[PDB]
């Protein structure tokens, strides 16, 4: 089964993610009927150690926001594609892995639910991310996971600053890139819910 790649859509909610993070929550949701479905997920030795290889040159430098991260501990990749999926709790951490990738100021994160299956696509990259995306879904018939419990962080940098702030947290939620954008995503509503 091979699929076209050219003239994607725009941006209509696969890549918006709800809270630029409650996506991986609606995932759970898929779990439930997974229960009975049962595609896959197990892979051998989901530890792939992971290392500081992302991009990181868009903005001069980074925020100070990511400094109360006091380095997270291990990056976060997974890729599947097939309605349900076992997910849930592994969904729900992808938060806290995902401060790790979001040094990287260019992360990967699209959700998609639809009646015929679900897919969803988390790297610690960005542009590539983008690329293997379209592959994935592509099979419409594949699930990997691949999460980590003792390995180090995507940044390359482990500032190790443990220190909070008071904007720190109000930075995070603007964006990092810019502002104006996770407003709209939570306008949305996801999570037995969808717009």
Same mark, same amino acid.
């Given at each position: ?14 890549? $918006?993610?709800?809270?630029?993070? $409650? ?5 759970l949701?898929?779990? #439930?009927?997974?229960d *009975? ?7 051998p ?8 290889? *992302?991009?990181?040159? !868009?903005?001069?430098?980074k925020?100070?926001?990511? !400094? ?10 997974? @890729? ?9 709790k592994?969904?729900?951490? &992808?938060?806290?892995? #995902?401060?790790?990738?979001? @040094? ?7 959700? @998609? &639910?639809?009646?015929? $299956?679900?897919?969803? @696509?988390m !790297?610690? *990259?960005?542009?590539?991310? #983008? ?10 018939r594949?699930?990997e ?21 008071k ?29």
């Amino acid at each position: 089964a091979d699929t076209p790649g050219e003239a994607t859509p725009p941006p209509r909610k696969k890549k $918006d993610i709800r809270d630029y993070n $409650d996506a991986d929550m609606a995932r759970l949701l898929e779990q #439930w009927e997974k229960d *009975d479905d049962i595609e896959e997920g197990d892979l051998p030795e989901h530890k792939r150690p992971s290392a500081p290889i *992302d991009f990181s040159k !868009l903005d001069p430098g980074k925020p100070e926001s990511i !400094l109360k991260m006091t380095k997270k501990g291990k990056t976060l990749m997974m @890729f599947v594609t097939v309605s349900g999926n076992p997910t849930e709790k592994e969904t729900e951490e &992808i938060t806290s892995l #995902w401060q790790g990738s979001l @040094f990287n100021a260019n992360y990967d994160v699209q959700r @998609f &639910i639809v009646g015929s $299956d679900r897919a969803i @696509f988390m !790297l610690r *990259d960005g542009s590539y991310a #983008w690329e293997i995306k379209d592959f994935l879904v592509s099979q419409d018939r594949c699930a990997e996971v691949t999460l980590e419990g003792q390995m180090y962080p995507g940044k390359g940098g482990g500032s190790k600053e443990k220190n909070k702030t008071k904007p720190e947290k109000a930075k995070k939620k603007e964006g990092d890139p810019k502002p104006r954008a996770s407003k709209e995503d939570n306008r949305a509503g996801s999570r037995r819910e969808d717009l």
